[model samples]
Target: DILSLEPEALQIADNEGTEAALSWLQARPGIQSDRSNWLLRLLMARVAEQTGKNDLALHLLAELDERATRLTLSQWEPELVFEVKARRLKLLRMKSAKTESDRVRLQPDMEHLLAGLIAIDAARAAVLCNS
Candidate 1:
């Protein structure tokens, strides 16, 4: 029951396009109340972006990242954190393309995030290679 509809939602997304999947998600207001709905929220943000709702997607990822930051280490989900960074990095890169000033302003932040992603990848690579 923890994530009862998650698979169904994802299947809908794959078969029906993001809008229909989002409609299903929106109809179930209580879905976000579950702790496991972190994945749900993230997917919704992805769907929002795909549907050209960039601002909503960015806000959702920001909120999710903040929540992840506040959790204790034991409760933390690194995979989710990694995805949040990846999505934000992608959004910013797209936004930065709008203007020269936007690119200039986002350069440092993008680099910083890219560095973080590379570090995470390296950390994971070490474990994966060892295993």
Candidate 2:
């Protein structure tokens, strides 16, 4: 079942709705262990975006990417490895922009970065290809 709030928040920073979705997830049982981290990352990103904390969002996204990299590499998942590499590229852009320019403008890029991290999770979960 697709959770409405998550996609909604990602597509548009709807803080209250996202919080409701998060509460729903937390109350649910049997969520795949591998998928939990990705969900948490998305929630954190949404909260940061809603609060106008783009720098923190970028930092959380980068950390999530690093975690995905570690999990994928440890599991010998090549597709996830590539996904993480791409996420890192995007994160580098966000990080540099935040350091050199206005941090607020990085919001859109942070969303894109979260999308990449979600992709990594999907690839890791479904593809299961060995490097």
Task: Give lDDT per model, in order.
Answer: 0.64, 0.54
Of candidate 2, the 10-residue stretch with the lowest lDDT total is: 122-131
Q: Write the per-residue lDDT of candidate 2 for residues 1-131, one digit (tens) a residue.
A: 33324544444345455445435545545445565546566676766676555677788788778776665442444455656656554454545633665766765655565455455556543332222
* TM-score for each model: 0.36, 0.34
Off by over 4 Å in 1: 1-23, 26-35, 76-131
Q: Which candidate number would show the highest TM-score if scored against the true structure? A: 1
Model 1 lDDT tens row, 1-131: 45444556767777887768778876765653335566577867766776545787888898889876665532345566677777776676466545766455666787777666665555653332221
> What's model 1's TM-score?
0.36
Best by lDDT: 1
